[PDB]
Design an enzyme around this catalytic site. Structure first.
Site, mmCIF file in Angstrom:
data_model
loop_
_atom_site.group_PDB
_atom_site.id
_atom_site.type_symbol
_atom_site.label_atom_id
_atom_site.label_comp_id
_atom_site.label_asym_id
_atom_site.label_seq_id
_atom_site.Cartn_x
_atom_site.Cartn_y
_atom_site.Cartn_z
ATOM 1 N N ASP A 268 -15.976 39.088 14.265
ATOM 2 C CA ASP A 268 -16.986 39.289 13.220
ATOM 3 C C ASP A 268 -18.403 39.096 13.781
ATOM 4 O OD1 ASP A 268 -18.439 39.453 10.875
ATOM 5 O OD2 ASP A 268 -17.790 37.513 10.084
ATOM 6 N N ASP B 172 -22.467 44.884 11.702
ATOM 7 C CA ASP B 172 -21.513 43.878 11.222
ATOM 8 C C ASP B 172 -20.080 44.389 11.394
ATOM 9 O OD1 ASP B 172 -20.095 41.860 9.894
ATOM 10 O OD2 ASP B 172 -21.033 42.152 7.970
#
Ligand SMILES: CC(=O)c1cc2cc(c1)C(=O)N[C@H]([C@H](O)CNC1(c3cccc(C(C)C)c3)CC1)Cc1cccc(c1)OCCCCN2
Length: 377
Positions: free
Chosen positions: A35, A220
């Site tokens: 992430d 992201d």
């Protein structure tokens, strides 16, 4: 020496890419979600219906309690736990061992995913957005301090169930074609970038470019969709609706709620436009663009009926927190997170999505005047 890290990411579509890690002495093995939109390293440490294994502090002779609680809320879904440290390894990564901060997840809500096959999260962003505060060294900052691994990593995410590569500490030149184009990291919290122009089928959206980055634009890997600020989203959906008016879709499709289906192999790809994001370059007045095909923002899903129809969800969604270039955007590309040189590189990936007459691309240079006015303050 990077071939050992090639193809070290697995995933089930729309449920995140994970790498294999070991924590504790003796090594306990877990699948950790990669992430770039957060900065906390955290693992399940207690039974959960959607967890098939978890970290057991009791059994690690290198565990150390930090006697502080922690919680991280994400866009939706959240967890709380207990901070500690322990030795960590990445079997298909660099051959090192770092003592790293770990949050042992003990309570969670809407965080773990049924069948995702991962049990923890690796926030790859900067300390500024760490919880509880920015003094908890995130995993990658620990790795770079304690070893000789250079301060960068690159991600190659391949679409659909899915796989990819996380090259830790360098760039693998066999994972991309063409040249790498770099955009500055505007501020080291998220991986924040500045979109300077947006085109749809070659037609400029012609918006004040502050709209693109209101209030921020980030890269992201932990979010599926391309998320656009409200006014940019409305402008973009209007242009995609118009380009595909040959066929009719539920208005709940444009909100991501209803699927759309066509008889297998008859998906009318040609009526969905390509989207170009122009990113701020490395020299004055210079930019480059990434082209997204519809096969990236029309994400495939499971047929609700007993058919073999191809069915798709619309993976462009409205945002109030800025632009998010999610996993959808990254799949065409090899993305270099050059933390040492404060920049992010894009190139066409070796596993790029294939259209019959169109191709994903990273093209430059382009001249763009007044790129500085595009950042939002
Ligand atoms: C639409 C939606 O609801 C949604 C969809 C998706 C992810 C997320 C939200 C999500 O929340 N993904 C988080 C990322 O960190 C998000 N990053 C941001 C964020 C938002 C709030 C707070 C922070 C702080 C803590 C740094 C960071 C910056 C955007 C990380 C994450 C948490 C749990 C499960 C995840 C993935 O896998 C699911 C697979 C991918 C599914 N797609």
């Amino acid at each position: 020496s990077f071939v050992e890290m090639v193809d070290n990411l697995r995933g089930k579509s729309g449920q995140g890419y994970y790498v294999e890690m070991t924590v504790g002495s003796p090594p306990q093995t877990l699948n950790i979600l990669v992430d770039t939109g957060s900065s906390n390293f955290a693992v399940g440490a207690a039974p959960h219906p959607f967890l098939h294994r978890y970290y057991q502090r009791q059994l690690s002779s290198t565990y150390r309690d930090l006697r502080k609680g922690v919680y991280v809320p994400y866009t939706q879904g959240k967890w709380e736990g207990e901070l500690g440290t322990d030795l960590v390894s990445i079997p298909h990564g660099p051959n090192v061992t770092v003592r790293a901060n770990i949050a042992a997840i003990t309570e969670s809500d809407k965080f773990f995913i049924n069948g995702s096959n991962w049990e923890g999260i690796l926030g790859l962003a900067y300390a500024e957005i760490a919880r509880p505060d920015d003094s908890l060294e995130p995993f990658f900052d620990s790795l770079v301090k304690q070893t000789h691994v250079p301060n960068l990593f690159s991600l190659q995410l391949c679409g659909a169930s899915v796989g990819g590569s996380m090259i830790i500490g360098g760039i693998d030149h066999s994972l991309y074609t063409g040249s790498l184009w770099y955009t500055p990291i505007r501020r080291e919290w998220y991986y924040e970038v500045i979109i300077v122009r947006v085109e749809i089928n070659g037609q400029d959206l012609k918006m004040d470019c502050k709209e693109y980055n209101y209030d921020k634009s980030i890269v992201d890997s932990g979010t599926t969709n391309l998320r656009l600020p409200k006014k940019v989203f409305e402008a973009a959906v209007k242009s995609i609706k118009a380009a595909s008016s040959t066929e009719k879709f539920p208005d709940g499709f444009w909100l991501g709620e209803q699927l759309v289906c066509w008889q297998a192999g008859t998906t009318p790809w040609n009526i969905f436009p390509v989207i170009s994001l122009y990113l701020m370059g490395e020299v004055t007045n210079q930019s480059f663009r990434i082209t997204i095909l519809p096969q990236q923002y029309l994400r495939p899903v499971e047929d609700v009926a007993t058919s073999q129809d191809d069915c798709y969800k619309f993976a462009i969604s409205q945002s109030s927190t800025g632009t998010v270039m999610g996993a959808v955007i990254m799949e065409g590309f090899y993305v270099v997170f050059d933390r040492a040189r404060k920049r992010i590189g894009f190139a066409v990936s070796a596993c790029h999505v294939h259209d019959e007459f169109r191709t994903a691309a990273v093209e430059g240079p382009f001249v763009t005047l007044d790129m500085e006015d595009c950042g939002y303050n």
